[PDB]
């Protein structure tokens, strides 16, 4: 439970498989996997002490297209 590389690989197994033997360790991770992996790590670190109304800011999407995005995703 206190292994860091193992648990990071576990919860970033999904987007490594989405944006790929395979590589998982940093100093071998090429672009979009690297950007989203680093962003996921920074979110997970900053969600403890940062405020909940300030850590996860949504991208500003208009109403009638964000609701359609949500409806198609729920479908």
């Amino acid at each position: 439970q206190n292994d860091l590389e193992l648990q990071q690989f576990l919860r970033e197994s999904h987007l490594l498989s989405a944006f790929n033997g395979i590589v998982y360790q940093d100093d071998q991770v090429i672009g979009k996997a690297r950007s989203r992996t680093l962003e996921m790590r920074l979110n997970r670190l900053s969600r403890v002490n940062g405020h909940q109304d300030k850590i996860n800011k949504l991208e500003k999407v208009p109403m009638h297209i964000r609701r359609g995005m949500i409806d198609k995703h729920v479908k």
Partner: protein, 177 residues
């Protein structure tokens, strides 16, 4: 050539609207190997037959595995990776390991993982495609990966957690390179 070979699986009823869609792709992907295949939609079956032009003797076995993968509800671009020599199936049996239903579903959900993380990390490490369905575990991949996932699943139905096997798989990759 050969004399005749004919295998057939039969699929559950809800799959027919998917199999009707993908069926022309199955005929392309098997007619490049000279294997006929019918999709019966009234008796609910899929048959594959060795035709008169089949010079590969063993490909009817992989066509059999392909149609029972389609019956066991893996999708088509996943399942046509069985027609190539380096890849095979395995159907692990997990029902006969533990007694009570609570411990069974908790060890099987442990095999899947939180958010699917354990299963996706296992697919990544073993280079396999794994389906935990019902009281069995389907898997497609190379044979070293199939050996690895079979020992992982059986020891997960026994009491040792699967992230120990995921850790030793990472250790063994970075120890084999």
């Amino acid at each position: 050539f050969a004399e005749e070979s004919s295998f057939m699986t039969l699929f559950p009823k809800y799959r027919e609207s998917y199999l009707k869609t993908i069926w022309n792709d199955v005929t392309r992907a098997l007619d490049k190997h000279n294997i006929a295949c019918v999709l019966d939609l009234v008796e609910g079956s899929m048959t594959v037959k060795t035709t008169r032009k089949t010079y590969d003797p063993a490909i009817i076995l992989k066509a059999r595995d392909l149609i029972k993968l389609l019956a066991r509800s893996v999708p088509f671009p996943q399942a046509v990776k069985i027609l190539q020599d380096d890849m095979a199936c395995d159907v692990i049996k997990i029902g006969n390991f533990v007694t009570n239903k609570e411990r069974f579903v908790k060890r099987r959900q442990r095999l899947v993982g939180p958010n699917g993380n354990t299963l996706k990390a296992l697919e990544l490490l073993t280079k396999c495609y794994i389906l935990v369905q019902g009281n069995t575990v389907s898997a497609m991949g190379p044979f070293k990966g199939l050996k690895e996932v079979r020992r992982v699943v059986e020891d997960c139905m026994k009491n040792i957690h699967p992230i120990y096997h995921i850790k030793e798989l990472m250790i063994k990759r970075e120890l084999a390179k």
